[PDB]
């Protein structure tokens, strides 16, 4: 039973992920050529999103903040892992018990869906099964950990969790917010994945404070991600994965070299041109650093460039991946803020270009200063046309994502789906076990975000029920009322947050609070989105938690403490673009 002991869920993720790609793609093709199908895809997409979690525990690849986990000894590192499993097991069991009761009640009173007509107890079997699988995978890893740690450690880990959860039941009533934030910080600091840290924080408040009936959690979990716009996350992630691993990044890098290889520092100008070209393919920063940093960094060092400068320019140059569409943070914002994704995408183009121009100019200045130079080659119209022809598959995707959205032809999630379908086609017919493994990786990666959004929706709901967005809004207005003085305060706050928190985690936590106040003083909701994303993209390359630095440092085996100094000038040039977009809303929103 080894195949079921390890790879039980993976076949379903592969089967489901392919389905929603085909279902949504077929829905789109017939729609354009010229309705119940969306209901089916949304039900399946919920199935893979929660089935894929059990995998993410056995791989132990859950996204989390490990700023102090790394600092802790090995012994304390193990204790942190047993605590994470217990905490994540408390959440998994609770959503299991409520999910069963919810199904039992739904059986008593049947209730069918609009289009499919399925009883609602059928599509909700994801909650009991998936949190049923999740709970066992936790039990396996917990069993393995206790073998690794021992009897003394295990009781230390368990007793610590007992004291952690004791106050919730000891006291009949405790204030909602202190418990909500107090626990969210603890789980975040200890090492629990952010998505889970939110869920347990919300779950703890419901218990002690009774903000919502406990039965709401399961219903919120399924309903919070029952929307079509959110489906653009897995589609874009799949499209990037099937193409990032392809090796077309080398074809772009050759094209970027052709354009900008002649100028002094032309190599570092080629790197930035590549990341910008690959920014219109991948919707992530670290996907861009890894997909390009793997190639350019060893090449730059060999040509003579300092490795640290090669690591720096690649980290910052890759942050453009989230600016130029596609990009996850915009999709996370468009869903969490209920803003227009078709407008956020076009919003970030101009800030993305300005950041690239800013870096290219600085690179030109640095190279000319240090005497660095590019390669020698007789590039001409013949060679340029040859390079364009080679990267054609890479350059075809931006047409689909932009033409579909900007042109008003397709919804953002429809255009995302066509991209993944295209990624598969070029992911096999231009390059089975590897293809099977990639599909698991895309679904595993998407589920890392959707589960975060579901747990955030429960979190955001408890905050709204406590009028937190107004409590913050009144304090800010009273302190100052000027729109400019306000946008400065937000932009600073996000900068401090970006050095400590993940981009997507911060977006979902903060958008529920910041969105109203900035709207009161007349900031466009979309404009605040571009500010938020651009302000968090700079968070990729800001220590200690550099979401892009870590990838580049690994590809170069550098030292972050030393790589941080090299990239500091690059941060400043990005902050210049940040202020320009914030306080000159005309140009960043030229299209949007």
């Amino acid at each position: 039973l080894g195949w079921l002991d390890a790879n039980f869920e993976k076949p379903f993720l592969v089967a489901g992920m392919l389905a929603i790609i085909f279902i949504i793609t077929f829905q789109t093709l017939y729609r354009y050529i010229g309705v119940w199908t969306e209901e089916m895809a949304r039900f399946i997409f919920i199935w893979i999103s929660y089935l894929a979690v059990p995998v993410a525990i056995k791989n132990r690849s859950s996204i989390r903040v490990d700023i102090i986990f790394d600092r802790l000894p090995v012994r304390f590192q193990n204790i942190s892992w047993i605590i994470v499993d217990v905490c994540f097991l408390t959440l998994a069991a609770t959503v299991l018990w409520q999910s069963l009761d919810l199904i039992k009640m739904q059986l008593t009173y049947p209730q069918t869906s609009p289009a499919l007509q399925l009883p609602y107890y059928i599509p909700y079997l994801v909650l009991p099964v998936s949190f049923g699988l999740m709970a066992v995978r936790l039990l396996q890893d917990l069993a393995g950990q206790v073998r690794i740690c021992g009897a003394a450690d295990t009781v230390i880990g368990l007793i610590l969790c007992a004291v952690l959860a004791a106050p919730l039941f000891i006291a009949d009533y405790i204030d909602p917010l202190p418990v909500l934030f107090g626990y969210f910080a603890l789980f975040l600091v200890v090492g629990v994945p952010i998505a889970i840290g939110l869920g347990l924080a919300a779950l703890a408040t419901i218990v002690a404070a009774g903000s919502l009936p406990i039965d709401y959690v399961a219903q919120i979990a399924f309903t919070s991600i029952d929307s079509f716009p959110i489906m653009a996350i897995p589609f874009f992630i799949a499209a990037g994965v099937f193409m990032g691993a392809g090796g077309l990044s080398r074809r772009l890098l050759n094209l970027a070299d052709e354009m900008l290889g002649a100028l002094p520092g032309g190599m570092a100008l080629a790197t930035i041109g590549t990341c910008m070209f690959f920014a219109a393919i991948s919707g992530s920063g670290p996907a861009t650093v890894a997909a390009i940093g793997s190639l350019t960094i060893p090449a730059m060092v060999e040509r003579g460039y300092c490795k640290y400068f090669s690591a720096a320019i690649v980290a910052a140059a890759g942050a453009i991946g989230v600016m130029i569409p596609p990009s996850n943070p915009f999709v996370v914002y468009g869903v969490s803020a209920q803003a227009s994704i078709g407008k956020l995408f076009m919003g970030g183009i101009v800030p993305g270009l300005l950041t690239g121009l800013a870096l290219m100019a600085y690179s030109y200045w640095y190279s000319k200063k240090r005497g660095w130079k590019g390669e020698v080659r007789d590039r001409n119209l013949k060679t340029f046309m040859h390079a364009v022809w080679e990267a054609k598959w890479a350059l075809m995707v931006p047409v689909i994502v932009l033409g579909g959205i900007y042109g008003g032809i397709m919804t953002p999630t429809e255009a995302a789906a066509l991209a993944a379908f295209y990624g598969l086609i070029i992911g096999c017919f231009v390059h089975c076990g590897s293809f099977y493994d990639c599909v698991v990786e895309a679904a595993g990666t998407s589920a890392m975000v959707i589960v975060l959004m579901s747990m955030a929706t429960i979190f955001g709901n408890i905050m709204t029920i406590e009028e937190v967005p107004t409590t913050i809004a009144q304090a800010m207005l009273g302190l100052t009322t000027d729109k400019i003085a306000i946008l400065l305060m937000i932009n600073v706050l996000l900068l401090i947050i970006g050095t400590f928190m993940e981009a997507l985690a911060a977006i979902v936590i903060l958008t529920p609070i910041l969105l109203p106040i900035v709207l009161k003083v007349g900031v466009d909701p979309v404009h605040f989105g571009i500010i938020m994303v651009v302000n968090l993209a700079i968070g990729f390359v800001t220590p200690p938690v550099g979401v892009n630095l870590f990838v580049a440092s690994g590809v170069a085996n550098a030292k972050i403490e030393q790589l941080s100094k090299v990239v500091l000038p690059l941060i400043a040039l990005m902050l210049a673009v940040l202020l320009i977009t914030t306080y000159v809303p005309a140009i960043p929103m030229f299209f949007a």
Partner: nanobody
Amino acid sequence: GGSLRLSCAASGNIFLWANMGWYRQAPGKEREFVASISLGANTNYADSVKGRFTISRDNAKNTVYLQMNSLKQEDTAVYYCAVWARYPSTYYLGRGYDYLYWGQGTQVTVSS
């Protein structure tokens, strides 16, 4: 056929509504759905209203506007200004429900 350019303003201790919308209850008919605008300015219209009525808002004054246009005798109903929160207030058997707060309404009569 001119435009009545309906405007509705909410008064209360609230800071700002997450959602706002319009419902029209024609005589001898049901309180149907006209239009709705999200906090981030996602506008959802009823099928008949698609492209005819534009809904906007002024977050500073806390006012929702329904720039009714190209009105016809097929549309002569009273109009109710509805506003509800960001998240559903109650859940029951795996569905989410909104508790809409309602305005008195303003007869919108159209002839020829």
